[PDB]
Amino acid sequence: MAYSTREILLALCIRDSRVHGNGTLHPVLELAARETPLRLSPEDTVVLRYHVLLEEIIERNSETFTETWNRFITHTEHVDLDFNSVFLEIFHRGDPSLGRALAWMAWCMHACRTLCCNQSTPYYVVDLSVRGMLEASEGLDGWIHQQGGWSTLIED
Amino acid sequence: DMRPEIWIAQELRRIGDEFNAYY
Ligand SMILES: [Br-]
Ligand SMILES: [Br-]
Ligand SMILES: [Br-]
Ligand SMILES: [Br-]
Ligand SMILES: [Br-]
Numbered sequence: 001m002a003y004s005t006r007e008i009l010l011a012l013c014i015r016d017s018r019v020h021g022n023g024t025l026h027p028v029l030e031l032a033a034r035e036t037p038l039r040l041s042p043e044d045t046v047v048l049r050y051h052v053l054l055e056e057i058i059e060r061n062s063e064t065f066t067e068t069w070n071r072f073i074t075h076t077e078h079v080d081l082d083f084n085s086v087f088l089e090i091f092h093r094g095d096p097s098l099g100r101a102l103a104w105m106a107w108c109m110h111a112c113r114t115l116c117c118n119q120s121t122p123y124y125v126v127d128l129s130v131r132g133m134l135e136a137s138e139g140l141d142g143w144i145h146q147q148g149g150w151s152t153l154i155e156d
Numbered sequence: 157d158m159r160p161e162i163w164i165a166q167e168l169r170r171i172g173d174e175f176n177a178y179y
Contacts, residue, residue: 064171068168085161089166097176103168
């Protein structure tokens, strides 16, 4: 362990894509895995367990996640930069806590799912969004280190 | 406009808090 938020997020999105509508990976998830030197398996036990938690969060809040995601994607002009803004508005507004971290992860993964499922979403949107979410999430790194890492967090 | 991102940030904060006592 000591895996980055980037690797865990990417392992969740890959895991998710596998579990969803014929299980193929979008080109940009193949790329991110290459460029993020993806060292974590998407079928690893931390990933499978976190997948459960995030999928629950998404269901309890199915409509909010949908609504919020659409408002974002229909209004952004640079998807890349805009991911970084919502991240900061969540996290540097009274510390991070477990739920906000997990609600963000849930949100990114959900976002990824919607993009890779919709066959007509342009490549560049799927691409910048994924890059957008992985880069923003680097900001959780220091704070999850303070807590012993992702594997630790889900262990207790 | 640049006001949606701050709405989303609001929601996720709530859901984040909601979760905290609920697991
Ligand atoms: Br693997
Ligand atoms: Br929740
Ligand atoms: Br859902
Ligand atoms: Br764009
Ligand atoms: Br800062």
